[PDB]
């Protein structure tokens, strides 16, 4: 739970920036597959420590 709160405070998803940096949402939302073609990626798989 604690690590979870720290992870999900960052955001459930992120977008790669044109400059290449990740930008996490800061929001806790359920993923939908409509998002798969969207700019967003699931944040579990960011591999950002």
């Amino acid at each position: 739970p604690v690590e979870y709160g720290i992870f999900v405070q960052r955001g459930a998803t992120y977008t790669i920036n044109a400059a290449g940096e990740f930008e996490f949402s800061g929001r806790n939302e359920k993923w939908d597959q409509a998002l798969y073609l969207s700019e967003h990626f699931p944040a579990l798989f960011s591999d950002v420590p």
């Binding site: 790669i16 920036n17 400059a19 290449g20 940096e21 420590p49």
Partner: protein, 1057 residues
């Protein structure tokens, strides 16, 4: 120094071992050593472990079998703290024992070992065709000519290339790699050109200007973002390298153009390629932020894409449209030539344009890293201004800037216990003087003292002024950090005032260590506590001046006559715990135990006596003046009768009250009471309350009455003000050259682009202005700037609005501050006492000058850096004759100020004083131009010459400041003078050389002999309040003690014609 000097070498080839060193390259026998074999580090803020092998192992692919080792389990094992060095070493060692690269050692000395292919084969556990080739023919790894090492595996396998995964440098992270390095079988330049051309037909690939082992290699990126971060890191590497090459230093660059060449990439990578090749000046100035490097780089391209310069714009565009070409300076190109000369078959990237770099003259200031800039704004500059727009400053959160009321006073502890004296001067007290002084004291009592003085006295409390210091002594003592101090020492008394617990030395100069688990509460102190201590110290210094120990003598007593809780009685009782037999008791009408509760005068039955008394009686009740007078009289009478060394308070020290006290002591039978007025540094800085010091002496006291005493002037000159007190505003709108601002300070923030404009405008008001950004990411720059009356008095003399805007724009964006920590400004900044006395004298002379009609100019001789500018009205012309003054012909012409810049001659015939002129001689007569002290007879002589020289003049007004002799009599007996001194009978204010003082009687007598009009005036209390209210200054304690006796003994002669 144009030509580059460099020694290019294939460092990566040099890293590859001889085949014979491969067996021991792990050093199986010995443990890996920190800083040589490995580089562990734990960043606690990031909670991220980072191990990094040195030597050949810096390039090392890991087999999943290698990743199954406990060494890599370690960071998970210690989520929050550093891996202990023992575990790191033992796991790193056992894993080193785990590795064994295939090799065939041979006796040829030309041979090397293909480290890359061997570690790769091992990492794939020899499953790839390269791993097969290596497991069957290890000898293929050995090589003489570096290139052939790969050609051998290209021919033998029949493949055109090999895709080697890259290594992460930090062996701990197992994250997927951004890209990977393909290696091509292209021995000739032609084969290389063809591969490059074909590479420009395919997605997301790039390559270096030249390659290691002279073998062509291409990076293939898994995404655009990976390509961007890679190109960025390389641009930083190339820029740093070129930055070093252009300094003419020899460099061991492994390659001449460190940056990557896109072969196919998106828009953004092409932009990075372009500004990268440009080598923009902005990098060298640190104008870019490297915290998010690529971002800034992209932004930089955006400027260059539309750059104000035509050459740089067209150059950037042209580079953007031919990204595949490798742009490089001529000076790089000659290095490429030297490289191709030393190694005729070296491969390097063939498509290459050679541009001449475009010079740019704009030297931006910049500094990433913490520290706010404290600008000193110039009054004027090359830039002109016309109707500048109002510059709004933003609201600032308390997260960034807090505005405390008064600056706490940093100070040495001993300085708290100082006091100043004022001895009586008059030999007689005429009855008409008694009626005059009584009328004065009654009129002054009936209508309350100045409201502004009350505001300052009630705002600048001594308790808060001392609080950070007294607590600090408590905090150190609580940690046991304090150790050595003498028994009677003032530091010891401060310690007793800081902690409630009794202290005890274990021996000479050594306090006892705290018992375990004991953390005694800080001593509770009211506002008068430290003052009462300082009065006790004063009596100790009065019984004999030379004493260092402050402990009371055995078999002696003291009384603190005014009492309540009276913490000082407890502190004093505990300070003297080691002295045998000593009474120490308070005795108020409100007194709580230990102190006896009793009224004064004492009941006729009760017997009260002591060797010392410290009265602090003060009736809270509003009352008739006659009752206040009779009560204070009876209090001084009983205080003097009861002790040989009374230290009575005088709440309303008019000349009448003090003189009535002297007359009353005169009336007591058979004893002659020597007396002196006194003021400790622990008093509230603004209080006019004064402590008379009564003692008996066998001799009758010549000159016992007071007249025009300093301590008395502090009170009597204060009177009810016509105006409301000047509350210090915080301004938020910087108008252009407006002159409407009430005293206070500008405070807020602006977009950093607008910052140079803001500093350009507030130069009109504030003399100096601290500024800072909070972070590299947030564009707003915070700015704080106290309003200087002197800068207003200078800048507003004329309507011209020049400034150094052109210089201030060299600051944006990194050149004007960084500070994450919240800053704390005060509405009342500390200033040394001499500075306050200067501002007071200026308020006196300025108010005096505004009254005079029809004067063409102010001639301030010895005016230094326009120090007297505040005094002169904006309309009339100002003149300076200080040799030390710097010349600024533009500032002088623009602001209406002549500067003679020559030593003023005091001989009367040579001297030429203009009519309708105000001649300031503020502290100039007491010194020679070179700064050596002028002997007092020469000072009275030059004052006499200024006097005789203006006798012919019709309308002229001299203001000759000087030092009266009486102060040396008073400072010899005082303690509170950290600034002022008395080295061999001469005053030594500030850092100035010691200087002999004039006697006022002989000076006035001489001026009467000359017959010129004269009036010895000194600045009073309202001038002090005006100075502090206008400049935003709080007085401070040592200043409060010394300012009365100092101000009174800097008379300002006012010659008038």
């Amino acid at each position: 120094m144009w030509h580059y000097t460099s020694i290019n070498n294939d460092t990566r080839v040099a890293l590859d071992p001889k085949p014979n060193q491969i067996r021991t390259i792990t050093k199986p026998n010995t443990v890996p050593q920190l800083g040589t074999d490995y580089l562990y580090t734990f960043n606690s803020q990031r909670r991220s472990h980072t191990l990094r092998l040195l030597g050949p192992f810096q390039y090392f692919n890991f087999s999943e079998t290698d990743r199954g080792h406990p060494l890599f389990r370690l960071p998970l094992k210690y989520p929050s703290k550093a891996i202990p060095a023992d575990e790191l070493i033992d796991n790193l060692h056992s894993w080193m024992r785990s590795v064994h690269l295939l090799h065939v050692r041979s006796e040829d000395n030309t041979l090397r070992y293909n480290w890359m292919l061997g570690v790769y084969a091992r990492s794939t556990n020899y499953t790839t065709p390269v791993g097969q080739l290596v497991v069957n023919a290890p000898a293929i790894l050995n090589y003489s000519n570096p290139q052939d090492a790969f050609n051998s595996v290209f021919v033998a396998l029949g493949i055109d290339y090999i895709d080697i995964p890259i290594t992460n440098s930090n062996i701990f992270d197992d994250s997927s790699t951004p890209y990977n390095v393909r290696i091509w079988h292209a021995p000739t330049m032609t084969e290389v050109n063809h591969i490059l051309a074909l590479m420009r037909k395919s997605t997301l690939v790039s390559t270096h200007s030249s390659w290691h082992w002279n073998v062509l290699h291409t990076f293939h990126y898994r995404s655009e973002s990976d390509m961007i971060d890679h190109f960025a890191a390389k641009i930083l590497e190339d820029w740093r390298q070129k930055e070093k090459l252009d300094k003419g230093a020899l460099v061991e660059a492994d390659r001449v153009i460190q940056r990557l060449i896109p072969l196919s990439s998106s828009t953004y990578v092409q932009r990075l390629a372009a500004i990268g090749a440009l080598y923009p000046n902005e990098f060298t100035e640190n104008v870019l932020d490297l915290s998010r490097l690529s971002t800034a780089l992209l932004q930089l391209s955006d400027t260059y894409y539309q750059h104000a310069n035509d050459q740089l714009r067209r150059l950037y565009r042209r580079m953007y449209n031919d990204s595949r070409t490798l742009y490089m300076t001529q000076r790089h190109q000659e290095l490429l030539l030297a490289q191709i000369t030393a190694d005729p078959n070296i491969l390097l990237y063939p498509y290459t344009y050679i541009f001449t770099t475009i010079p740019t003259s704009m030297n931006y200031i910049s500094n990433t890293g913490q520290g706010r800039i404290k600008h000193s704004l110039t009054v004027t500059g090359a830039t002109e201004h016309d109707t500048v727009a109002d510059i709004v400053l933003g609201q600032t959160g308390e997260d960034v800037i807090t505005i405390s009321m008064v600056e706490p006073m940093s100070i040495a502890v001993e300085d708290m216990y100082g006091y100043v004296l004022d001895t009586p001067t008059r030999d007689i007290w005429p009855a008409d003087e008694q009626i005059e002084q009584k009328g004065d004291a009654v009129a002054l009592y009936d209508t309350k003292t100045s409201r502004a003085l009350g505001m300052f006295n009630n705002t600048v409390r001594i308790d808060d002024l001392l609080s950070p210091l007294l607590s600090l002594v408590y905090r150190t003592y609580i940690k046991g950090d304090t150790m050595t101090m003498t028994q009677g020492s003032l530091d010891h008394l401060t310690l007793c005032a800081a902690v409630d617990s009794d202290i005890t030395f274990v021996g000479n100069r050594m306090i006892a260590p705290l018992p375990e688990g004991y953390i005694p509460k800080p001593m509770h102190r009211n506002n008068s506590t430290m003052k009462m201590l300082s009065l006790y110290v004063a009596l100790k210094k009065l019984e004999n001046f030379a004493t260092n120990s402050y402990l009371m003598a055995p078999d002696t007593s003291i009384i603190l006559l005014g009492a309540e809780r009276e913490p000082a009685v407890n502190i004093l009782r505990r300070f003297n715990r080691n002295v045998s037999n000593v009474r120490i008791i308070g005795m108020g009408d409100r007194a709580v135990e230990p102190n006896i509760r009793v009224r004064v005068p004492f009941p006729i039955d009760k017997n009260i006596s002591a060797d010392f008394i410290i009265c602090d009686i003060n009736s809270y009740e509003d009352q008739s003046f006659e009752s206040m007078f009779s009560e204070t009289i009876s209090v001084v009478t009983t205080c003097a009768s009861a002790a040989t060394r009374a230290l009575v308070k005088i709440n309303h020290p008019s000349e009448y009250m003090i003189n009535s006290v002297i007359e009353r002591l005169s009336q007591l039978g058979g004893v002659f009471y020597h007396t002196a007025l006194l003021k400790t540094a622990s008093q509230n800085p603004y209080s006019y309350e004064t402590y008379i010091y009564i003692t008996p002496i066998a001799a009758a006291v010549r000159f016992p009455f007071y007249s025009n005493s300093a301590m008395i002037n502090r009170y009597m000159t204060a009177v009810a003000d016509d105006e409301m007190p000047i509350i210090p505003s915080i301004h938020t709108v910087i108008k252009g050259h407006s002159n409407t601002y009430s005293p206070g300070l500008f405070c807020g923030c602006v977009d950093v682009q607008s910052a140079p404009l803001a500093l350009s405008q507030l130069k009109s008001y504030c003399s100096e202005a601290t500024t800072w950004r909070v972070d590299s990411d947030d564009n707003l720059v915070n700015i704080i700037a106290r309003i200087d009356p002197a800068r207003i008095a200078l800048e507003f003399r004329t309507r011209s609005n020049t400034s150094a805007y052109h210089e201030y724009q060299r600051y944006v964006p990194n050149g004007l501050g960084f500070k994450v920590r919240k800053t704390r400004e005060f509405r009342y900044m500390h200033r040394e006492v001499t500075f306050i006395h200067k501002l007071m004298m200026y308020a006196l002379i300025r108010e005096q000058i505004s009254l005079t009609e029809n004067m063409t100019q102010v001639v301030s001789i010895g005016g230094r850096n326009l120090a007297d500018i505040s005094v002169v009205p904006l309309n009339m012309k100002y003149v300076v004759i200080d040799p030390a003054t710097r010349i600024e012909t533009l500032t002088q012409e623009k602001k209406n100020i002549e500067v003679q810049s020559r030593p003023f001659q005091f001989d009367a015939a040579n001297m030429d004083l203009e009519n309708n002129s105000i001649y300031l001689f503020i502290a100039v007569i007491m010194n020679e131009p070179n700064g050596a002290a002028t002997p007092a007879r020469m000072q009275m002589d030059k004052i006499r010459n200024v006097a005789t020289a203006m006798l012919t003049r019709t309308n002229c007004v001299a203001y000759i400041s000087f030092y009266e002799a009486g102060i040396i009599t008073r400072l010899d007996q005082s303690t509170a003078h950290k600034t002022i001194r008395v080295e061999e009978g001469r005053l030594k204010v500030a850092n100035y050389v010691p200087v002999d003082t004039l006697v006022e009687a002989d000076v006035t007598l001489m001026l009467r002999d000359i017959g010129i009009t004269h009036e010895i005036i000194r600045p009073s209390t309202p001038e002090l309040i005006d100075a502090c209210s206008n400049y935003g200054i709080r007085l401070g304690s040592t200043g409060g003690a010394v300012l009365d006796v100092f101000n009174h003994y800097s008379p300002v002669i006012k010659l008038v014609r």
